[PDB]
Amino acid sequence: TPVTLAKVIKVLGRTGSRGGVTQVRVEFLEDTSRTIVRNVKGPVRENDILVLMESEREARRLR
Amino acid sequence: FTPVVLATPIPEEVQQAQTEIKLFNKWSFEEVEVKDASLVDYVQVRQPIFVAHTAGRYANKRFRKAQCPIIERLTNSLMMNGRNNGKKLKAVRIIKHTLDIINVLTDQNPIQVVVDAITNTGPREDTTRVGGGGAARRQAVDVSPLRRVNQAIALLTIGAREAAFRNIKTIAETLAEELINAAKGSSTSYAIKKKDELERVAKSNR
Amino acid sequence: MVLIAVNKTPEQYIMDTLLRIRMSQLEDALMVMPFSYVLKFLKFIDTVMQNKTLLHSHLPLICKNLF
Amino acid sequence: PPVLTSKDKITKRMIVVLAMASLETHKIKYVLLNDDHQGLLKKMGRDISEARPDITHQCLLTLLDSPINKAGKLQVYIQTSRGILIEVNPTVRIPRTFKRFSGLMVQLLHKLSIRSVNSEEKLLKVIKNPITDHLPTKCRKVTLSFDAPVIRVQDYIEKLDDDESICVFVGAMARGKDNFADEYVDEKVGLSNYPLSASVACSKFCHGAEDAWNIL
């Protein structure tokens, strides 16, 4: 399974109607110097580690 | 040197194992580590404990809760649903009896089975009720490492209490049944079912 | 061998969104954007510098966003 | 054979939910809306599609007389047009007449449960939404729709696992959209290239299931 780890490098801002989803640009660990902006669900502070499921997909807006 | 036993006597095994190693009641706090390359410092272990009773001041900070010992976090998840509120001495007792069971069958020091049941049931993504206009759809999101700690223990103590509901098999029996079927991925337990059911929907609706 | 962004050149709309945006909290809208936004972005700076246009923008704006 | 309820989540089985059913009460004694009031629907400020319980009685006599109920791998849950979700014990005896069925449904809606006439068990229960808490854990959910692709029943049942149950959602209505379970199911499926009634689709998925699960 393509398990991919990502590290939080900064926080960006809040998007979504539920008010718990946070736009976060992360830097993935293995083979670095590329980054993806993603959307967390629970409480995340900086330099947390998350597990990416898909490799290349980003979301930008939640109504 | 040559320390003797004092006027107030102490049992020998109490004298022996405690000063040598900072263990549990009867369990080491050397080996098993994390096998996952995540959730570090959400795993409290090292620091070690004797028993899982502490007036822990971990509540008034956003992330001091992660520095609570996870074995005592298990006991936090037991003493609920009305009839068990309070009753911390009940929950600490059952944890001891459950650790009696697991270290007998395929010994594998039973905090391994604790750690493996947490890492292998955390849903690594999840969906929310995102609006979209009227018809509230769902969008796949990668949930925090802290909630993956939270949702791991939650599915354990819920499913084990429901399994021990209206039968002969007790709390400590059914909870040990949950841990063995979740330390290895088997989906015969409550949580490994519910982990996969959450992760199959987010793949469908991505 | 599209009717509107707005102008005879579309890049004038690119500066115009920089004209319309407030002087405060613009870094929050800028920090969202990925690296491909930069690769698409510097072409307009080369467009206005080969265009020799400073009528609809100014150099502290372009250097401000650049920085 | 064991009697299946909502408490058992493990045994592979077939569950049908008559969603969007027409259960409306009326005062004159409390009576159901239908025959008896088709000349007084507008007089009471009511709707015609809100007066169709014969489809529900028809589908209950369809499903509960199926041999898979007699084999014991079937559960019936019913959601009204107002959303009232109902657990049906499969050993219940439905009256064949519309009148005793009607007083039974009035007694169900006002008394909020029907109990056994011989033992200490619920013959009928009003349960809470959502359905997925009441459903078993591993279970495929599909919505019957004529505007959904038409497949064969037996093969797609043979696509399932040994532990995955099956449940299907039927809009118990005269007409309208089949969008009552967009928030729930994995797949919308069709059974025929022709428009059907609900009970014919019920007997289709029942008899295809009994052909697949070897029920005679």
From Swiss-Prot, chain A:
Homology family: Belongs to the eukaryotic ribosomal protein eS28 family.
UniProt name for this protein: Small ribosomal subunit protein eS28A
Keyword set includes Ribosomal protein: yes
Signal peptide: none
Role according to the record: Component of the ribosome, a large ribonucleoprotein complex responsible for the synthesis of proteins in the cell. The small ribosomal subunit (SSU) binds messenger RNAs (mRNAs) and translates the encoded message by selecting cognate aminoacyl-transfer RNA (tRNA) molecules. The large subunit (LSU) contains the ribosomal catalytic site termed the peptidyl transferase center (PTC), which catalyzes the formation of peptide bonds, thereby polymerizing the amino acids delivered by tRNAs into a polypeptide chain.
Record-linked SUPFAM superfamilies: Nucleic acid-binding proteins
Main location: cytoplasm
Further remarks about this protein from its record: Present with 94500 molecules/cell in log phase SD medium. There are 2 genes for eS28 in yeast.
InterPro entries referenced in this protein's UniProt entry, alphabetically: NA-bd_OB-fold (IPR012340), Ribosomal_eS28 (IPR000289), Ribosomal_eS28_CS (IPR028626)
Any one Gene Ontology molecular-function term assigned to this protein's record: structural constituent of ribosome
Ribonucleoprotein as UniProt keyword: yes
PTM per Swiss-Prot/TrEMBL: N-terminally acetylated by acetyltransferase NatB.
Swiss-Prot record, chain B:
Post-translational modification: N-terminally acetylated by acetyltransferase NatA.
GO process annotations (BP): cytoplasmic translation; maturation of SSU-rRNA; regulation of translational fidelity; ribosomal small subunit assembly; ribosomal subunit export from nucleus; translation
Keywords from the UniProt entry: Acetylation, Cytoplasm, Isopeptide bond, Phosphoprotein, Ribonucleoprotein, Ribosomal protein, Ubl conjugation
This protein's GO CC annotations: 90S preribosome; cytoplasm; cytosol; cytosolic small ribosomal subunit; ribosome
Covalent link (Glycyl lysine isopeptide (Lys-Gly) (interchain with G-Cter in ubiquitin)) residue numbers: K26, K184
Gene3D superfamilies: Ribosomal protein S7 domain (1.10.455.10)
Main location: cytoplasm
Subcellular location per the Swiss-Prot or TrEMBL entry: Cytoplasm
InterPro entries the UniProt entry points to: Ribosomal_uS7 (IPR000235), Ribosomal_uS7_CS (IPR020606), Ribosomal_uS7_dom (IPR023798), Ribosomal_uS7_dom_sf (IPR036823), Ribosomal_uS7_euk/arc (IPR005716)
GO molecular function annotation: mRNA binding; rRNA binding; structural constituent of ribosome
Residue list for modification Phosphothreonine: T8
Family according to the record: Belongs to the universal ribosomal protein uS7 family.
Subunit structure, as described in the record: Component of the small ribosomal subunit (SSU). Mature yeast ribosomes consist of a small (40S) and a large (60S) subunit. The 40S small subunit contains 1 molecule of ribosomal RNA (18S rRNA) and 33 different proteins (encoded by 57 genes). The large 60S subunit contains 3 rRNA molecules (25S, 5.8S and 5S rRNA) and 46 different proteins (encoded by 81 genes).
Protein's recorded name: Small ribosomal subunit protein uS7
Organism: Saccharomyces cerevisiae (strain ATCC 204508 / S288c) (Baker's yeast)
UniProtKB/Swiss-Prot annotation, chain C:
Signal peptide location: none
Parts forming coiled coils: none
Disulfide bonds: none
Subcellular location: Nucleus, Nucleolus
Subunit structure: Interacts with snoRNA U3. Interacts with MPP10. Component of the ribosomal small subunit (SSU) processome composed of at least 40 protein subunits and snoRNA U3.
Something else known: Present with 9620 molecules/cell in log phase SD medium.
Function, as annotated: Involved in nucleolar processing of pre-18S ribosomal RNA.
Family: Belongs to the WD repeat WDR3/UTP12 family.
Protein name: U3 small nucleolar RNA-associated protein 12
Taxonomic path: Eukaryota, Fungi, Dikarya, Ascomycota, Saccharomycotina
Part of the whole protein covered: 773 to 858 of 943
Curated annotation (Swiss-Prot), chain D:
Protein family per UniProt: Belongs to the class IV-like SAM-binding methyltransferase superfamily. RNA methyltransferase NEP1 family.
Role summary: S-adenosyl-L-methionine-dependent pseudouridine N(1)-methyltransferase that methylates pseudouridine at position 1189 (Psi1189) in 18S rRNA. Involved the biosynthesis of the hypermodified N1-methyl-N3-(3-amino-3-carboxypropyl) pseudouridine (m1acp3-Psi) conserved in eukaryotic 18S rRNA. N1-methylation is independent on acp-modification at the N3-position of U1191. Also has an essential role in 40S ribosomal subunit biogenesis independent on its methyltransferase activity, facilitating the incorporation of ribosomal protein S19 (RPS19A/RPS19B) during the formation of pre-ribosomes.
Protein name listed in UniProt: Ribosomal RNA small subunit methyltransferase NEP1
Effect of R96A: Loss of substrate rRNA binding
Predominant subcellular localization, coarse grouping: nucleus
Site entry: Stabilizes Arg-88: D54
Site feature location: Interaction with substrate rRNA: R52, R93, R96, R100
Mutant lacking the gene: phenotype: Depletion of EMG1 affects growth and leads to strong ribosome biogenesis defects, with defects in 20S pre-rRNA and mature 18S rRNA species.
SUPFAM superfamilies attached to this UniProt entry: alpha/beta knot
Enzyme category, top tier: transferase
